[PDB]
Amino acid sequence: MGMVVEETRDLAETADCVVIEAILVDDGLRYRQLSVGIKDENGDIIRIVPISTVLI
Amino acid sequence: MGMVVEETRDLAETADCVVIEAILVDDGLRYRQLSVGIKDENGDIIRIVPISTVLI
Amino acid sequence: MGMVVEETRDLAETADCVVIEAILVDDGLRYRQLSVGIKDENGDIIRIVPISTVLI
Amino acid sequence: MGMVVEETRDLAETADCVVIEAILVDDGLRYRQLSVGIKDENGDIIRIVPISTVLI
C-alpha cells in the first residue's frame, strides 16, 4: 500500500492494447500516470507498462 | 511537412504493441512525443496512437 | 488536416503572456494542448508556443 | 520492491532546493525520475518531492 490509486480511466483501446490513466495519491500529493496495458486473446490485461507519471 | 521528425526510438516492445518515442522539431523548437504503435500478426505497425508531446 | 480544434480557453493572462488551452480531436481521440501566447504592447498576441499535448 | 534505483545525479542546487535526477529500472525498463529536494538551514535535505517519471 502506502500509495493509493484513486481513479483509473480507459483513454484508448484496441483488440490488443489499451492506454490507461491512473490518478495516484502518495504522501498527500496527486499524480497522473499514463500506462499501456497488454491484452491477451481473452481481452484481459496481462502486463502494465508505465509510460509517464507527473505531479498534478 | 513543416514539422520534422528528427529521431525515433523503441522504448518497449511486445508481440502486439510497442511504445515509441520521437523527437520533433517545429518552428525551431524541439519536442519529445511518446506514442503507442499497434502491430498486426505480421509484426508491422498499423496504427500510431500519440500519448503525449512535451517541449524539451 | 486530420486533427480538429474543438475548444480553446484562456487559463491565465499577464502583461506579456497568456496561457492557452485547446482540446484537440484526432482519429477519434481527445487531447489537451497547453500553449503560451506572446503579447505585444498593443495587447495582441504575436506568437503561440505549444508547451505540451496529452491524451485525455 | 520490483524497481531498482540505478543512478542519481544532482542537476542544480539552491539555498533551499536541489533538483535530483534518478534512473529507475523496473521489469527490464528504464525510467528517468526528476525530484525536488528541500534543504534546511543546516544544508541537509529535509524532504524529497517527486515531480515526474518518464520511460526512457
Author numbering:
A (entry chain A), B (entry chain A), C (entry chain B), D (entry chain B): -1 to 54
Source paper text:
Here, using functional metagenomic selection, we describe AcrIIA22, an unconventional Acr found in hypervariable genomic regions of clostridial bacteria and their prophages from human gut microbiomes. AcrIIA22 encodes a 54 amino acid protein that impairs SpyCas9 activity. Instead, guided by an X-ray crystal structure of AcrIIA22, coupled with mutational and biochemical analyses, we show that AcrIIA22 encodes a DNA nickase. By nicking a supercoiled plasmid substrate and relieving its torsional stress, AcrIIA22 renders the target less susceptible to SpyCas9 activity.
Anticipating that structural homology might provide better insight into its mechanism of inhibition, we solved AcrIIA22’s structure using X-ray crystallography. The asymmetric unit in AcrIIA22’s crystal comprises 2 monomers stacked end to end, with each monomer folding into a 4-stranded β-sheet. A DALI structure–structure search revealed that the AcrIIA22 monomer is similar to members of the newly recognized PC4-like structural fold. Despite crystallizing as a homodimer, AcrIIA22 migrated from a size exclusion chromatography (SEC) column at an elution volume corresponding to a calculated mass approximately 4 times larger than its expected monomeric molecular weight. Indeed, AcrIIA22 was predicted to form a stable tetramer when analyzed with PISA, a tool for inferring macromolecular assembles from crystal structures. This putative tetramer has a molecular mass consistent with that observed by SEC and comprises pairs of outward-facing, concave β-sheets. A series of hydrophobic interactions likely stabilize this configuration of β-sheets instead of the typical α-helical interactions seen in other PC4-like proteins, potentially explaining the absence of an α-helix in AcrIIA22. Consistent with this possibility, AcrIIA22’s β-sheets orient along each outward face of the putative tetramer, resemble those in PC4-like proteins, and form a groove that could potentially accommodate a nucleic acid substrate. Our tetramer model predicts that an interface at the C-terminus of AcrIIA22 is required for adjacent β-sheets to bind one another and form a grooved, oligomeric structure. Instead, we speculate that D14 may contribute to AcrIIA22’s nicking activity, as 2 D14 residues from different AcrIIA22 monomers sit very near to one another in our proposed tetramer, such that they may be stabilized via the presence of a divalent cation under physiological conditions.
